[PDB]
Write a protein that binds this ligand. Structure first.
Ligand SMILES: NC[C@@H]1O[C@H](O[C@H]2[C@@H](O)[C@H](O[C@@H]3[C@@H](O)[C@H](N)C[C@H](N)[C@H]3O[C@H]3O[C@H](CO)[C@@H](O)[C@H](O)[C@H]3N)O[C@@H]2CO)[C@H](N)[C@@H](O)[C@@H]1O
Ligand SMILES: [Mg+2]
Ligand SMILES: [Mg+2]
Ligand SMILES: [Mg+2]
Ligand SMILES: [Mg+2]
Ligand SMILES: [Mg+2]
Ligand SMILES: [Mg+2]
Ligand SMILES: [Mg+2]
Ligand SMILES: [Mg+2]
Ligand SMILES: [Mg+2]
Ligand SMILES: [Mg+2]
Ligand SMILES: [Mg+2]
Ligand SMILES: [Mg+2]
Ligand SMILES: [Mg+2]
Ligand SMILES: [Mg+2]
Ligand SMILES: [Mg+2]
Ligand SMILES: [Mg+2]
Ligand SMILES: [Mg+2]
Ligand SMILES: [Mg+2]
Ligand SMILES: [Mg+2]
Ligand SMILES: [Mg+2]
Ligand SMILES: [Mg+2]
Ligand SMILES: [Mg+2]
Ligand SMILES: [Mg+2]
Ligand SMILES: [Mg+2]
Ligand SMILES: [Mg+2]
Ligand SMILES: [Mg+2]
Ligand SMILES: [Mg+2]
Ligand SMILES: [Mg+2]
Ligand SMILES: [Mg+2]
Ligand SMILES: [Mg+2]
Ligand SMILES: [Mg+2]
Ligand SMILES: [Mg+2]
Ligand SMILES: [Mg+2]
Ligand SMILES: [Mg+2]
Ligand SMILES: [Mg+2]
Ligand SMILES: [Mg+2]
Ligand SMILES: [Mg+2]
Ligand SMILES: [Mg+2]
Ligand SMILES: [Mg+2]
Ligand SMILES: [Mg+2]
Ligand SMILES: [Mg+2]
Ligand SMILES: [Mg+2]
Ligand SMILES: [Mg+2]
Ligand SMILES: [Mg+2]
Ligand SMILES: [Mg+2]
Ligand SMILES: [Mg+2]
Ligand SMILES: [Mg+2]
Ligand SMILES: [Mg+2]
Ligand SMILES: [Mg+2]
Ligand SMILES: [Mg+2]
Ligand SMILES: [Mg+2]
Ligand SMILES: [Mg+2]
Ligand SMILES: [Mg+2]
Ligand SMILES: [Mg+2]
Ligand SMILES: [Mg+2]
Ligand SMILES: [Mg+2]
Ligand SMILES: [Mg+2]
Ligand SMILES: [Mg+2]
Ligand SMILES: [Mg+2]
Ligand SMILES: [Mg+2]
Ligand SMILES: [Mg+2]
Ligand SMILES: [Mg+2]
Ligand SMILES: [Mg+2]
Ligand SMILES: [Mg+2]
Ligand SMILES: [Mg+2]
Ligand SMILES: [Mg+2]
Ligand SMILES: [Mg+2]
Ligand SMILES: [Mg+2]
Ligand SMILES: [Mg+2]
Ligand SMILES: [Mg+2]
Ligand SMILES: [Mg+2]
Ligand SMILES: [Mg+2]
Ligand SMILES: [Mg+2]
Ligand SMILES: [Mg+2]
Ligand SMILES: [Mg+2]
Ligand SMILES: [Mg+2]
Ligand SMILES: [Mg+2]
Ligand SMILES: [Mg+2]
Ligand SMILES: [Mg+2]
Ligand SMILES: [Mg+2]
Ligand SMILES: [Mg+2]
Ligand SMILES: [Mg+2]
Ligand SMILES: [Mg+2]
Ligand SMILES: [Mg+2]
Ligand SMILES: [Mg+2]
Ligand SMILES: [Mg+2]
Ligand SMILES: [Mg+2]
Ligand SMILES: [Mg+2]
Ligand SMILES: [Mg+2]
Ligand SMILES: [Mg+2]
Ligand SMILES: [Mg+2]
Ligand SMILES: [Mg+2]
Ligand SMILES: [Mg+2]
Ligand SMILES: [Mg+2]
Ligand SMILES: [Mg+2]
Ligand SMILES: [Mg+2]
Ligand SMILES: [Mg+2]
Ligand SMILES: [Mg+2]
Ligand SMILES: [Mg+2]
Ligand SMILES: [Mg+2]
Ligand SMILES: [Mg+2]
Ligand SMILES: [Mg+2]
Ligand SMILES: [Mg+2]
Ligand SMILES: [Mg+2]
Ligand SMILES: [Mg+2]
Ligand SMILES: [Mg+2]
Ligand SMILES: [Mg+2]
Ligand SMILES: [Mg+2]
Ligand SMILES: [Mg+2]
Ligand SMILES: [Mg+2]
Ligand SMILES: [Mg+2]
Ligand SMILES: [Mg+2]
Ligand SMILES: [Mg+2]
Ligand SMILES: [Mg+2]
Ligand SMILES: [Mg+2]
Ligand SMILES: [Mg+2]
Ligand SMILES: [Mg+2]
Ligand SMILES: [Mg+2]
Ligand SMILES: [Mg+2]
Ligand SMILES: [Mg+2]
Ligand SMILES: [Mg+2]
Ligand SMILES: [Mg+2]
Ligand SMILES: [Mg+2]
Ligand SMILES: [Mg+2]
Ligand SMILES: [Mg+2]
Ligand SMILES: [Mg+2]
Ligand SMILES: [Mg+2]
Ligand SMILES: [Mg+2]
Ligand SMILES: [Mg+2]
Ligand SMILES: [Mg+2]
Ligand SMILES: [Mg+2]
Ligand SMILES: [Mg+2]
Ligand SMILES: [Mg+2]
Ligand SMILES: [Mg+2]
Ligand SMILES: [Mg+2]
Ligand SMILES: [Mg+2]
Ligand SMILES: [Mg+2]
Ligand SMILES: [Mg+2]
Ligand SMILES: [Mg+2]
Ligand SMILES: [Mg+2]
Ligand SMILES: [Mg+2]
Ligand SMILES: [Mg+2]
Ligand SMILES: [Mg+2]
Ligand SMILES: [Mg+2]
Ligand SMILES: [Mg+2]
Ligand SMILES: [Mg+2]
Ligand SMILES: [Mg+2]
Ligand SMILES: [Mg+2]
Ligand SMILES: [Mg+2]
Ligand SMILES: [Mg+2]
Ligand SMILES: [Mg+2]
Ligand SMILES: [Mg+2]
Ligand SMILES: [Mg+2]
Ligand SMILES: [Mg+2]
Ligand SMILES: [Mg+2]
Ligand SMILES: [Mg+2]
Ligand SMILES: [Mg+2]
Ligand SMILES: [Mg+2]
Ligand SMILES: [Mg+2]
Ligand SMILES: [Mg+2]
Ligand SMILES: [Mg+2]
Ligand SMILES: [Mg+2]
Ligand SMILES: [Mg+2]
Ligand SMILES: [Mg+2]
Ligand SMILES: [Mg+2]
Ligand SMILES: [Mg+2]
Ligand SMILES: [Mg+2]
Ligand SMILES: [Mg+2]
Ligand SMILES: [Mg+2]
Ligand SMILES: [Mg+2]
Ligand SMILES: [Mg+2]
Ligand SMILES: [Mg+2]
Ligand SMILES: [Mg+2]
Ligand SMILES: [Mg+2]
Ligand SMILES: [Mg+2]
Ligand SMILES: [Mg+2]
Ligand SMILES: [Mg+2]
Ligand SMILES: [Mg+2]
Ligand SMILES: [Mg+2]
Ligand SMILES: [Mg+2]
Ligand SMILES: [Mg+2]
Ligand SMILES: [Mg+2]
Ligand SMILES: [Mg+2]
Ligand SMILES: [Mg+2]
Ligand SMILES: [Mg+2]
Ligand SMILES: [Mg+2]
Ligand SMILES: [Mg+2]
Ligand SMILES: [Mg+2]
Ligand SMILES: [Mg+2]
Ligand SMILES: [Mg+2]
Ligand SMILES: [Mg+2]
Ligand SMILES: [Mg+2]
Ligand SMILES: [Mg+2]
Ligand SMILES: [Mg+2]
Ligand SMILES: [Mg+2]
Ligand SMILES: [Mg+2]
Ligand SMILES: [Mg+2]
Ligand SMILES: [Mg+2]
Ligand SMILES: [Mg+2]
Ligand SMILES: [Mg+2]
Ligand SMILES: [Mg+2]
Ligand SMILES: [Mg+2]
Ligand SMILES: [Mg+2]
Ligand SMILES: [Mg+2]
Ligand SMILES: [Mg+2]
Ligand SMILES: [Mg+2]
Ligand SMILES: [Mg+2]
Ligand SMILES: [Mg+2]
Ligand SMILES: [Mg+2]
Ligand SMILES: [Mg+2]
Ligand SMILES: [Mg+2]
Ligand SMILES: [Mg+2]
Ligand SMILES: [Mg+2]
Ligand SMILES: [Mg+2]
Ligand SMILES: [Mg+2]
Ligand SMILES: [Mg+2]
Ligand SMILES: [Mg+2]
Ligand SMILES: [Mg+2]
Lengths: 48, 275
RNA sequence: GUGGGAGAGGGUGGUGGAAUUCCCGGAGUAGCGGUGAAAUGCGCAGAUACCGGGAGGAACGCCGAUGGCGAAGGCAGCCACCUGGUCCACCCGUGACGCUGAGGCGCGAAAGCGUGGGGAGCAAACCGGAUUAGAUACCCGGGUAGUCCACGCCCUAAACG
RNA sequence: CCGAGGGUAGGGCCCGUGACUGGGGCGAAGUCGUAACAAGGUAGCUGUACCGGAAGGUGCGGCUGGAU
RNA sequence: CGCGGGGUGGAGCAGCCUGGUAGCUCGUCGGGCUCAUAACCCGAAGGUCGUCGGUUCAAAUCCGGCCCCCGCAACCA
RNA sequence: GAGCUAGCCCUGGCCAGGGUGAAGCUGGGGUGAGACCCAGUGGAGGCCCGAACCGGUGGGGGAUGCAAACCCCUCGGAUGA
RNA sequence: GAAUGCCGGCAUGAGUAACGAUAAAGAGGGUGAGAAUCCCUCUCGCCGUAAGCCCAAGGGUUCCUACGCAAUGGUCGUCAGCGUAGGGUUAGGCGGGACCUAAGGUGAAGCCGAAAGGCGUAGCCGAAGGGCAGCCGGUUAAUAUUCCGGCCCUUCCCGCAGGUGCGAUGGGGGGACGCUCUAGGCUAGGGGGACCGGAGCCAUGGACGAGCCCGGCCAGAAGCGCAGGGUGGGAGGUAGGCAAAUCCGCCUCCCAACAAGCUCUGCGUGGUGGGGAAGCCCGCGGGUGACAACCCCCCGAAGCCAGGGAGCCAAGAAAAGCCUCUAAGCACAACCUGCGGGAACCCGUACCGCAAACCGACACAGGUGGGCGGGUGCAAGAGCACUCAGGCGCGCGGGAGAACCCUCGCCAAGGAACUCUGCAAGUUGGCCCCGUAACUUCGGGAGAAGGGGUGCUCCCUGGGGUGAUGAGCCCCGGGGAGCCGCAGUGAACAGGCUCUGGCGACUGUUUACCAAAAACACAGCUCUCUGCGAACUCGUAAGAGGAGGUAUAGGGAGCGACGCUUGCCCGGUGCCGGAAGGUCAAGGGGAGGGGUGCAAGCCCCGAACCGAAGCCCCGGUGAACGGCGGCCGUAACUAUAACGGUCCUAAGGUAGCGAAAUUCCUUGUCGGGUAAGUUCCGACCUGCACGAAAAGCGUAACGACCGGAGCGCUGUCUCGGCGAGGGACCCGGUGAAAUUGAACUGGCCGUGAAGAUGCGGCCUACCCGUGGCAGGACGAAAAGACCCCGUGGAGCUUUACUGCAGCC
RNA sequence: CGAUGUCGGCUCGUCGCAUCCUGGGGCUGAAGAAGGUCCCAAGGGUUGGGCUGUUCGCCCAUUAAAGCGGCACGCGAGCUG
């Protein structure tokens, strides 16, 4: 059947993208905990 | 007249459509139409405010002159009569002698090619707009401004009409289509005559598809719901109300007058609607 | 054919007044209303009765008749438009073109039916009060369809001279 | 080939019959009321509509085959 | 068989915080009115209070035991 | 977190073929004019058969499965909500 | 030493199940240490509206080549989408950007919110929509509308020549639009040829032939031809298009109009540039064929002309490019036309792409949008059967031919006797014609039912299209005579039908993953609210929706097409109405009392009375919440009770229906069907416990709904038998799992916590496997979901308590 | 209750005797035939169908007879549902 994941690079970058987290105050805290933790990916890797 | 159909399908048995006899022009005027924003009951928050709306046919908003005092004294000629899907009424395309083309609601009896004129110097004949103080008492009107220079707000549906019952000081008394007697100012404009397409209420939709074409989504009964969705929901088996008939928000819907008693318009309303 | 005459003959569009009911204001108080007698009812929350104002619907007093018109059913304030029928005079024209009429077609009071409006009064069903052995009635107080309009059905009668 | 007839399938009309049901006709002395005949004690009859154990009552219109 | 309510004149019902009075309607009977019945008017009669115990000075009444009558309940499996 | 799903908005796309034969129109009949009737044309429909497509009725299989929803036979819709 | 403990390791099941669609393989040659699995050839099978080809999304080097096989590949492996290395993606014209705008997002102004932040006409962002200038071939191991070859085109800059009042973010036109049907002409595509070209072939009985086999085109600027789209020209006035306007709109008049002209597009021709098979040779391409031929006829699109036409209602985006108008401004400028020269950027371009490369943990029988999708036959068709081009034989095989299972085929006689039930499987099947009932809302029912025809050959003949009016080709027929077989939609693809009741009118929708229904929805009916800054809804607000709507409209509720109807109760509750009265908080008022101070004073209580909503109270209201009785007696046989009495209520169930989706007793009783009927149907009515919009009673049509019956036909059954394939079985390769206290694990009668392999007494039993069947191990699985317990939790309800939003 | 799957049907049987039939008997209100009752006996047999989920039961047509029970109301690691 049709599964939950139907990738779209357009949807990937406009939902979990860096500009998307920086607009909302909750997403700026996402990047704060993520830099503090030391993750190598601050946002999911997407190409175009 | 109302056009019916033979029962070749079960829906065509009761389905009725309008005669569309008064329509002379098929497509609207390009310089007067603009797109209509379809909401589907959604507000700026994206939430449904008014339940069961959406899925209608695509429409174009026809700019209707609900003022008519922009051009006082300048006569116009009824170039054509068209259909407006944003309302029950039919519209009249007006070619003024000034050169500007406009749209007004087409009143009953308005023939194509005759001349209309707005202003206090206008005669009393169908299609003409005058302030409520210059229209004679006892004549039926429509497109009535409720407050001066705010636009036509009264008697705009198909087949509706309001009658001047008298004058009292600076205001006039009007019998609205709900039967309500209200005191409206005399400088408020009104186009004389009743609105056309009086056979609009005689249209039987025939099937559920016609409601979906108009934008009317299926209405769910509260009894068919559950207790989290409605007060009438619940009960093993079919069950009655068990409480006074209420809306999904808690308020009763059988007799509850929801009008604000301290509204300042109560001082200008003589009698409430009856029947 | 010409020239006239009467008439609630029919359809449409307007319009006048009296009266009933309801609303608002004034003024006023201890009852009103109703019957054979009462009671329900309405009424100190100010009714009835009275004055003024407004809304709405229906029906047209006097004229009015032992009258008129229409084929019948039926038709009554008034104005106007459209229109049917009939009668008199002249003796002008056509020259039997006439009479009736199974079917057919049309009209057809009231009640009823569908869609929509309108609903003041009245009023089946219904409710109450009385009468009564009982009263699903007569009497009374309320009262919904209906009565009214537009369109479409119904086509019955003591549709009787 | 036609062909009496036989078979299959579906119709039409008529007759007999059927639990039960509907009104009807009739049968001296059963029961309930008293609608009509007199102004029959609410004048009657009528078409229609609604109601009521029942005759019937009431509304709308019509008739006199209604006395004073 | 588990809860609640009731058995009162020929019939239907009251009288029970109430201990001490048994009341209302219809019927029955006697007399009127009528030719006569019905209606109506006048005047009467009519009750072991289901039954047996107990409490009490005194039980239709208060409290138990059965005898009937009625209405609910008889659930999860 | 609406890339699954539910609804709505914007812009596009898709629905082989066959069958039934509404209104209207034309012609004739009918009438005082009509209503109406017949024939032809016409090609309407939450119309029919039926694929693609969207579903998921009944049964069988599958049950550490090909598959944390599948497969086979059969079945509903398929110009519309 | 235990916590269904945690982490790791290794066992057991066990050489067991499985090796992932039953589309299928066999032989020869080669490589190599090694080959069922790699390469080649031959034969066979499978797809062919795909299992072939192109594009988008996604993926991100998987592409190509060379050397390799430890691991990945369900086996093997010399092979590979695997490992190492190198190579490979070329654009002014294709897609995106330097153009436009939609929903939406953002957001100068502005508005709002403790803060964060939320709105917001303009503007900007935003695409698979609008706009936009390249087609054919060749080439590489791998890219090509990109490189090359041929022929075309666009924008920008500069120069020259001609022309004009030039000029914009502004005005106007245009862009600019639905659904269904459809005309004419072309094209894509396809079929045929007795014609043209071609390597060849004559087999096995026949054929040197109008023989078989193969192929018979693509693109192409300006011209020209054909077919279509768009569009009137002039003059005068002009107060509107937020300044201006010669443009546009409005008015008048003249010219002409199914045209013509102008412009634009498609198609054909077109200078010229390419391509070019079968076969045969050299080995996944190349050469030859070949100086290849490159014509004629027919079918004909859903694509093109296109912004075509017609009909219908549900009334069918915006903005820029483009044309025009003028404004500042400039008229040495600027714009247009033509010509010439120069300039032309960034990103993508490999490969998979219905799949071994995407989404499903797998090289997973699942899911995935668009375009092309040939031929023949079946009425048509994208269906179905075979088959072009192209791609595969699904990455374990070889044997055997047990039980059993799956999938399939057939069957005597019977024909539903099976069973909860004809569940399943049969029968029926397409087309043409004849014919067709109750009932009906007159459409329907209806494919009713039932029945005949269907192949081939020959003869005669009618109509249409293309041609021309004829031949030829193509389509649709009609009649007559024959032939064959068991059978003519000879295979494949295609309803079993009827009578009758319940429910819902219907098409639809729904529990993704146990329920598709009688539930939801629905047109339609009614009640109620709402006069617009509407009611209502979301939000603290601003603001939105409602609605750019205005009572023929909008919100809420119940009922649910239609037909006939929806009776009585307003006592309680809700709602609506009521300038009285009663109660009523803050506040006002302050008779009076108190504290303190020597005092003026200061301070604290405080009665009458005034004082809203609400409640009380008086009315109204049922398509508002709801409710619609009990006992006794009476008819001249009995029986029953039309009638009466009495008690209670606010009023005591009207019509219609009724053992019903409702009836406990109940398989009520009677009838029908049956040989027999707890079901079904028709009635009766003592309706435990129907009932009139939580509608009542009917109702044509419809239903993968639920009952009952009949015909047809059957392996459903009596009653089973046989046959096929895939497993099971054996052998080779790989090789799990839940489970498991240890185990050397018999029966019976007892006993034991009450159901013993393990205790007792007897009996029985050599050791160990393999295929099978499942009675036991209270077998496995899931700390019972039923039940209770816990002063555990959560969803829900209300006249439970308390509080909040909201409203008054 | 860290699970003993629950009615009935199907398939498969096995046992008990308080015996439905068949066999051997005693008494009889046993003439004969056929019954009634009781004793012995479990070796074999104990039908098909309509109704209902039904066990049971009623009914149809037979029969020598159409027995009653136990086996976790035997039997779902055999099936149905
Ligand atoms: N005549 C036939 C019909 O009779 C009806 O009436 C019938 C009954 O109503 C009527 O019953 C009557 C009754 O009215 C009257 N009050 C009492 C009388 N005993 C009865 O009489 C009836 O029954 C008895 C036996 O029972 C018979 O002997 C007698 O013949 C018969 N008429 O007797 C008639 C039957 O005979 C209607 N009156 C009438 O409309 C209609 O015509
Ligand atoms: Mg997916
Ligand atoms: Mg995942
Ligand atoms: Mg994308
Ligand atoms: Mg780093
Ligand atoms: Mg009209
Ligand atoms: Mg019609
Ligand atoms: Mg219908
Ligand atoms: Mg349009
Ligand atoms: Mg526009
Ligand atoms: Mg927004
Ligand atoms: Mg938002
Ligand atoms: Mg909505
Ligand atoms: Mg508009
Ligand atoms: Mg709808
Ligand atoms: Mg619309
Ligand atoms: Mg609904
Ligand atoms: Mg529910
Ligand atoms: Mg919720
Ligand atoms: Mg609730
Ligand atoms: Mg409820
Ligand atoms: Mg409720
Ligand atoms: Mg439930
Ligand atoms: Mg219920
Ligand atoms: Mg419910
Ligand atoms: Mg209710
Ligand atoms: Mg509430
Ligand atoms: Mg009124
Ligand atoms: Mg008079
Ligand atoms: Mg003369
Ligand atoms: Mg009449
Ligand atoms: Mg009438
Ligand atoms: Mg009384
Ligand atoms: Mg009255
Ligand atoms: Mg009525
Ligand atoms: Mg008369
Ligand atoms: Mg014959
Ligand atoms: Mg009388
Ligand atoms: Mg009398
Ligand atoms: Mg009388
Ligand atoms: Mg009655
Ligand atoms: Mg009456
Ligand atoms: Mg008369
Ligand atoms: Mg008389
Ligand atoms: Mg006496
Ligand atoms: Mg005498
Ligand atoms: Mg007497
Ligand atoms: Mg419970
Ligand atoms: Mg319970
Ligand atoms: Mg999420
Ligand atoms: Mg979505
Ligand atoms: Mg069609
Ligand atoms: Mg359809
Ligand atoms: Mg396709
Ligand atoms: Mg399925
Ligand atoms: Mg499963
Ligand atoms: Mg199907
Ligand atoms: Mg279909
Ligand atoms: Mg321990
Ligand atoms: Mg441990
Ligand atoms: Mg093991
Ligand atoms: Mg082995
Ligand atoms: Mg094993
Ligand atoms: Mg094995
Ligand atoms: Mg195996
Ligand atoms: Mg495989
Ligand atoms: Mg070899
Ligand atoms: Mg070698
Ligand atoms: Mg492939
Ligand atoms: Mg990947
Ligand atoms: Mg790699
Ligand atoms: Mg490769
Ligand atoms: Mg390897
Ligand atoms: Mg190896
Ligand atoms: Mg390997
Ligand atoms: Mg694998
Ligand atoms: Mg090697
Ligand atoms: Mg590699
Ligand atoms: Mg180029
Ligand atoms: Mg670009
Ligand atoms: Mg640039
Ligand atoms: Mg932009
Ligand atoms: Mg914002
Ligand atoms: Mg953006
Ligand atoms: Mg684009
Ligand atoms: Mg585009
Ligand atoms: Mg481009
Ligand atoms: Mg080449
Ligand atoms: Mg290239
Ligand atoms: Mg190319
Ligand atoms: Mg120029
Ligand atoms: Mg210019
Ligand atoms: Mg411009
Ligand atoms: Mg448009
Ligand atoms: Mg449309
Ligand atoms: Mg061609
Ligand atoms: Mg062809
Ligand atoms: Mg050819
Ligand atoms: Mg030979
Ligand atoms: Mg201007
Ligand atoms: Mg050309
Ligand atoms: Mg070649
Ligand atoms: Mg050569
Ligand atoms: Mg297409
Ligand atoms: Mg067009
Ligand atoms: Mg349409
Ligand atoms: Mg826009
Ligand atoms: Mg712009
Ligand atoms: Mg740049
Ligand atoms: Mg590329
Ligand atoms: Mg590809
Ligand atoms: Mg595809
Ligand atoms: Mg692949
Ligand atoms: Mg594989
Ligand atoms: Mg993978
Ligand atoms: Mg796959
Ligand atoms: Mg899908
Ligand atoms: Mg798909
Ligand atoms: Mg053939
Ligand atoms: Mg076919
Ligand atoms: Mg095609
Ligand atoms: Mg196929
Ligand atoms: Mg094949
Ligand atoms: Mg091939
Ligand atoms: Mg057989
Ligand atoms: Mg048979
Ligand atoms: Mg059945
Ligand atoms: Mg079946
Ligand atoms: Mg029949
Ligand atoms: Mg027919
Ligand atoms: Mg047939
Ligand atoms: Mg043959
Ligand atoms: Mg052609
Ligand atoms: Mg096949
Ligand atoms: Mg078939
Ligand atoms: Mg079929
Ligand atoms: Mg039934
Ligand atoms: Mg249905
Ligand atoms: Mg419905
Ligand atoms: Mg659905
Ligand atoms: Mg489900
Ligand atoms: Mg689930
Ligand atoms: Mg269904
Ligand atoms: Mg399902
Ligand atoms: Mg329901
Ligand atoms: Mg509706
Ligand atoms: Mg209805
Ligand atoms: Mg809210
Ligand atoms: Mg709006
Ligand atoms: Mg707008
Ligand atoms: Mg319902
Ligand atoms: Mg009612
Ligand atoms: Mg009634
Ligand atoms: Mg009643
Ligand atoms: Mg009553
Ligand atoms: Mg009440
Ligand atoms: Mg009340
Ligand atoms: Mg009251
Ligand atoms: Mg007072
Ligand atoms: Mg105070
Ligand atoms: Mg108050
Ligand atoms: Mg009550
Ligand atoms: Mg008696
Ligand atoms: Mg019954
Ligand atoms: Mg029964
Ligand atoms: Mg029963
Ligand atoms: Mg029962
Ligand atoms: Mg009876
Ligand atoms: Mg009865
Ligand atoms: Mg009941
Ligand atoms: Mg109700
Ligand atoms: Mg219903
Ligand atoms: Mg019902
Ligand atoms: Mg019914
Ligand atoms: Mg009917
Ligand atoms: Mg269904
Ligand atoms: Mg359906
Ligand atoms: Mg078998
Ligand atoms: Mg075989
Ligand atoms: Mg086999
Ligand atoms: Mg074997
Ligand atoms: Mg084996
Ligand atoms: Mg041992
Ligand atoms: Mg024991
Ligand atoms: Mg033991
Ligand atoms: Mg031991
Ligand atoms: Mg021992
Ligand atoms: Mg076992
Ligand atoms: Mg266990
Ligand atoms: Mg537990
Ligand atoms: Mg559960
Ligand atoms: Mg419990
Ligand atoms: Mg508990
Ligand atoms: Mg507690
Ligand atoms: Mg405790
Ligand atoms: Mg608790
Ligand atoms: Mg337990
Ligand atoms: Mg255990
Ligand atoms: Mg069996
Ligand atoms: Mg056995
Ligand atoms: Mg014995
Ligand atoms: Mg013996
Ligand atoms: Mg003997
Ligand atoms: Mg034995
Ligand atoms: Mg034995
Ligand atoms: Mg035995
Ligand atoms: Mg049974
Ligand atoms: Mg059965
Ligand atoms: Mg039983
Ligand atoms: Mg057990
Ligand atoms: Mg037991
Ligand atoms: Mg037991
Ligand atoms: Mg058992
Ligand atoms: Mg077992
Ligand atoms: Mg089981
Ligand atoms: Mg079982
Ligand atoms: Mg077991
Ligand atoms: Mg079940
Ligand atoms: Mg089942």
């Amino acid at each position: 059947m049709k599964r939950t994941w139907q990738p779209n690079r357009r949807k990937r970058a406009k939902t979990h993208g860096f500009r998307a987290r920086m607009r909302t105050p909750g997403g700026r805290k996402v990047l704060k905990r993520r830099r503090q933790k030391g993750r190598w990916r601050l946002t999911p890797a997407v190409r175009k | 007249a109302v056009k019916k159909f033979k029962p070749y399908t079960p829906s065509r048995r009761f389905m009725t459509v309008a005669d569309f006899s008064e329509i002379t022009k098929t497509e609207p005027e390009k310089s007067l139409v603009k797109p209509l924003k379809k909401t589907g009951g959604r507000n700026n928050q994206g939430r449904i405010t008014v339940r069961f709306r959406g899925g209608g046919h695509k429409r174009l908003y026809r700019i209707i002159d609900f003022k008519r005092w922009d051009k006082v004294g300048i006569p116009a000629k009824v170039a054509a009569i068209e259909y407006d899907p944003n309302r029950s009424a039919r519209i009249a395309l007006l070619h003024y002698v000034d050169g500007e083309k406009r749209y007004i609601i087409a009143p009953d009896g308005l023939q194509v090619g005759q001349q209309v004129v707005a202003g206090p110097d206008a005669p009393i004949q169908v299609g003409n707009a005058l302030p409520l103080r210059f229209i004679p008492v006892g004549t039926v009107v429509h497109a009535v401004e409720l407050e001066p220079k705010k636009g036509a707000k009264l008697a705009r549906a198909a087949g509706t009409s309001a009658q001047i019952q008298g004058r009292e000081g600076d205001y006039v008394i009007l019998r609205l289509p709900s039967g309500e007697l209200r005191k409206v100012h005399g400088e408020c404009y009104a186009t004389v005559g009743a609105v056309g397409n009086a056979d609009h209420k005689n249209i039987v939709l025939g099937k559920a598809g016609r409601s979906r074409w108009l934008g009317r989504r299926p209405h769910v009964r509260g009894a068919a719901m559950n207790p989290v969705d409605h007060p009438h929901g619940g009960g093993e088996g079919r069950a009655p109300r068990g409480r006074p008939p209420a809306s999904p928000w808690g308020w009763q819907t059988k007799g509850l007058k929801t009008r604000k008693r301290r509204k300042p318009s109560s001082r200008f309303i003589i009698a409430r609607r009856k029947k």
